A paper describes a structure:
Herein, we describe the structural characterization of AIH from Medicago truncatula (MtAIH), the model legume plant. The enzyme is responsible for the second step of the AGM pathway of PUT biosynthesis, that is the hydrolytic conversion of AGM to N-carbamoylputrescine (NCP) with the release of ammonia. AIH belongs to one of the seven types of guanidine-modifying enzymes (GMEs). It is a member of the pentein superfamily that is characterized by the propeller-like arrangement of five repeated motifs that form a narrow channel with a central, negatively charged core. The monomer of MtAIH is no different in this matter, i.e., five motif repeats (I–V) are arranged around fivefold pseudosymmetry axis that is aligned with the catalytic tunnel in the core of the protein.
Author numbering:
A (entry chain A), B (entry chain B): 12 to 104, 112 to 374
Write the structure that this text describes.
C-alpha cells in the first residue's frame, strides 16, 4: 500500500545538494553556491531543509546557510538531488514511509552519460535514508526523479524521449518500464509525452522541464508562441496529447501554458570559467540552455520559481504561477540562470520528504 | 540550568567513530574495524547506535555493521568519539538538551599532541549536533570527554596530570579551569586526582583510564598489588585522596579496586603493521600499553567491558564488575587489545546521548 504523494502535499523536509565541481560549475561553483543558498533559505521559510555537502565544502555551506537549515556531510559526484536523491513513498492510516533506491547511471551510463564516475552519486539515496532511519526499497531499473511526475491520485506523466532511451534500460520494454512505475510509485495510469524540452540533451528530455501537475486534473506546460522555435512543435504535440487523454480518475486535463524565456545561450565568459576535463561533457559557448519556468519546487505554502533575467517572461511566469497556485506565496529566485548553465534548475536541485 | 548527567543514566543513543588511518591502526585498521563492530553490536542490544565513517569507509562500515545500527558520513582525523564528540548536557523541568563543543587540540597541540592535523576532528562536535538539531554551546577551553567523570549529583573527578598540562590550557589557572567545569557540567565540586594511569603519555593521564563513578559516592579505581610496578604509587596516591575527601553532598567515597592486566607490551608484529609517517606519533616495539578495565562503557543496563587476552585478569574484571553493577549485564569484548595498541579502549570510542 505504498505510493508517491504529489509534491504539493505536506512535507516534513526538503533535501538539497551543494555544488562544487569546477568542471561543471563556473569559477569553482562560487556563483552556484549563492543561488543554492538563496533557494535553501527561501524554502526554509516554509518547511525544514537539509543541505548535503562534501567534507571539503561542509564549513562553506554551514557558513552561507542560516542555522535553522541543517547541514550534513554527504559526498556526491554532483549536486542534483532531484535525480540522485531517494524517491519517497508513503502508506497513510507499521512503517508509513519509505524510499526507493532506483539505479542511477549519470543520465546515460558510460556510452551517453554526463560523467564517467557516479559511484558516490549512487550511494546518496542509501546515505540519506540511513540518516533518517527510513526503509530502502532497492530497484535495479535506471530512473531519475526528474523524469516522472505524479498527482498523488493514481496518475504519472513521463517522456518517451527519456525513459525509452537505450542509454537507460535497454533490457526492458516500454510496457515493462510502465509496470515498474505503477508497482513502485503506486499509480494505475501513465501518460507518455513523446518528447521533453528542446535542448535538454543532458537528461534526454526530463518531463520536469516540460510539464508538471499543479493539482488533480491540471498541468503547466512549457510553451512558446514562436513557431520558428524548435520548442513549438514539442509543446504543441504535448498539448494535443493532453486533449486526447484523461487522468487515472477520468478527469479532462486543464492545460496551462508557461512561456519559456529567451531562448538563452551560454556566453564565452560563462563557458570560459568551467575547467575542461576528459571525465565530464565539454560546455561550449553558443549552447542553447534548457530553460523552463516549469522547473520550480512546491514547498509547504510556497512556489519557489526560477528567474533567468529575461524580464518580460520572468514577470509573466510569476503571474501565471500566482494564479495557478492561488493559496501559495510565489517567490522568484533571481540568478536561476546560474543553475541552468550547468544543466538544471530549482526542481532539479530539490527532493521533498513527505510528512506522514 | 543545564548539567552533565551521569553515564549510568538513560540514553537515547551512542555515537561511535570508525577507525581507518594506517599510521595508527595496524594493517590499515582491519583488526580494529572488527572490534568496533563487536562493540557497536553489543551496545546496540541496549540502546540505538550511530557509527560515523568517512566517505572512503562508508560502504565498508555499512557492510560490517548490523542493519539496526545507523551509519552516517562524518569524517574525522581519528576515531576517538569520547574526546572529539560532544559532551551532552540536559535541563529537567523550551530546549531540554544541548551539547558542549570544547576546543580540541589532539591531546596536546603541535608540540605534544598525537597528530599534527586535527581540523576534521574539530568539526565532529558541530556535525553531530547539526545532524541531531541539538543546540551547541561553544567553549574556547581545551577539554576531552575522557578527561572528566560525573556522578550526576554535583561532583566531578579528573586529573591534574591532564588538565594542568601546559599543552592544554597554558593561560588558565587551575581555579579558572575548575570554574568552567562547574558552570558547564553543572557541578559544585571537582576532585583532582593528581595522576592517571602510568604509560598514558598519549592523553597525559585521562581519568577515564584511572577512575570512574559506579554510583554517587562510589568509584572503581585502576589497581595493582605489585609495589615494584610504577603504577602502584599512582594508584596508592589516588586511593589516599578518596580516604580524605568528600563529594558535593559531603558523602564519603566507597572505593572498589580493579586490577590492571599485564603489564602489556607491544609486539614487533604489532608495531610493523603501522605505516611510518611524520604527522603521527611513532609506535615502537616494547612500548608499555595503557591498559585498564576501568575504560569501560555504561550502556542502558549493560557494562561493555574490555578483555585484553590476559585471562587471569580478564576473568577477574568481569567478576568485580558483575558484582559492582548487579543490576547491569556485563559484556566482555574479546580483542580489546587491538584498541589499546592505538591508545584507548571502549570508553574512549563511545559518547552517550542522554534521553530527555
Ligand atoms: N547534468 C545533469 C543535470 C540534471 C538535471 C535534472 C532534471 N531534474 O531535469
Ligand atoms: Na544524456
Ligand atoms: Na600528549
Amino acid at each position: 500500500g505504498f505510493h508517491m504523494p504529489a509534491e504539493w502535499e505536506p512535507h516534513s523536509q526538503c533535501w538539497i545538494g551543494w555544488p562544487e565541481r569546477a568542471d561543471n560549475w563556473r569559477d569553482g561553483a562560487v556563483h552556484a553556491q549563492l543561488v543554492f543558498t538563496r533557494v535553501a533559505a527561501a524554502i526554509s521559510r516554509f518547511e525544514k531543509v537539509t543541505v548535503c555537502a562534501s567534507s571539503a565544502q561542509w564549513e562553506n555551506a554551514r557558513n552561507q546557510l542560516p542555522d535553522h537549515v541543517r547541514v550534513v556531510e554527504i559526498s556526491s559526484n554532483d549536486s542534483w538531488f532531484r535525480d540522485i536523491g531517494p524517491t519517497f513513498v508513503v502508506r497513510r492510516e507499521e512503517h508509513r514511509i519509505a524510499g526507493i533506491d532506483w539505479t542511477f547511471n549519470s543520465w546515460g551510463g558510460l556510452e551517453d552519460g554526463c560523467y564517467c564516475d557516479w559511484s558516490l552519486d549512487s550511494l546518496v539515496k542509501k546515505k540519506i535514508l540511513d540518516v533518517e532511519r527510513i526503509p530502502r526499497f532497492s530497484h535495479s531499473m535506471v530512473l531519475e526523479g526528474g523524469s516522472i511526475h505524479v498527482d498523488g491520485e493514481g496518475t504519472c506523466i513521463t517522456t518517451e524521449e527519456c525513459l525509452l532511451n537505450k542509454n537507460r534500460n535497454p533490457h526492458l520494454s516500454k510496457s515493462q518500464i510502465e509496470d515498474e512505475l505503477k508497482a513502485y510509485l503506486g499509480v494505475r495510469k501513465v501518460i507518455w509525452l513523446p518528447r521533453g524540452l528542446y535542448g535538454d540533451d543532458d537528461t534526454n528530455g526530463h518531463v520536469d522541464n516540460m510539464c508538471c501537475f499543479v493539482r488533480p486534473g491540471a498541468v503547466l506546460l512549457s510553451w512558446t508562441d514562436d513557431k520558428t522555435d524548435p520548442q513549438y512543435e514539442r509543446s504543441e504535440e504535448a498539448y494535443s496529447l493532453f486533449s486526447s487523454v484523461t487522468d487515472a480518475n477520468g478527469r479532462k486535463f486543464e492545460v496551462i501554458k508557461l512561456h519559456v524565456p529567451g531562448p538563452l545561450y551560454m556566453t564565452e565568459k560563462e563557458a570560459a570559467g568551467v575547467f575542461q576535463d576528459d571525465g565530464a561533457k565539454p560546455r561550449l559557448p553558443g549552447t542553447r540552455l534548457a530553460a523552463s519556468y516549469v522547473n520550480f519546487y512546491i514547498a509547504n505554502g510556497a512556489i519557489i520559481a526560477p528567474q533567468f533575467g529575461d524580464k518580460k517572461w520572468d514577470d509573466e511566469a510569476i503571474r501565471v504561477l500566482s494564479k495557478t497556485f492561488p493559496h501559495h506565496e510565489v517567490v522568484g529566485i533571481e540568478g536561476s540562470r546560474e543553475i541552468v548553465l550547468s544543466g538544471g534548475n530549482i526542481h532539479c536541485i530539490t527532493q521533498q520528504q513527505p510528512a506522514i
